Amino acid sequence: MPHAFKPGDLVFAKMKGYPHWPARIDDIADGAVKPPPNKYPIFFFGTHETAFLGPKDLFPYDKCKDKYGKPNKRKGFNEGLWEIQNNPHASY
Numbered sequence: 001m002p003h004a005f006k007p008g009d010l011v012f013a014k015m016k017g018y019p020h021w022p023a024r025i026d027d028i029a030d031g032a033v034k035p036p037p038n039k040y041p042i043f044f045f046g047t048h049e050t051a052f053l054g055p056k057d058l059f060p061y062d063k064c065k066d067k068y069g070k071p072n073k074r075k076g077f078n079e080g081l082w083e084i085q086n087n088p089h090a091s092y
Helices: 061-068 077-086
Strands: 010-013 021-025 040-044 050-053 058-060
Touching (some): 010 061
Antiparallel strands (some): 040 050
């Protein structure tokens, strides 16, 4: 049975104009900007950018890596695939 999303969860996160992208639910640092209500801070691997997304755009990495985890020509995507597989919890 699934729980709510929590910091450290590994996902593919979907944004307009981009393929489903390897990402994680980030923590929020002390003193850092907080997300809007019902949004999560999503750290995109490879690009290392953060956007605030709701669960409608968040897919579990393990369940969906066969579908979404293939190399892609988009900038940073293949670096992102390496990060989510090999050091997804590192400091970036």
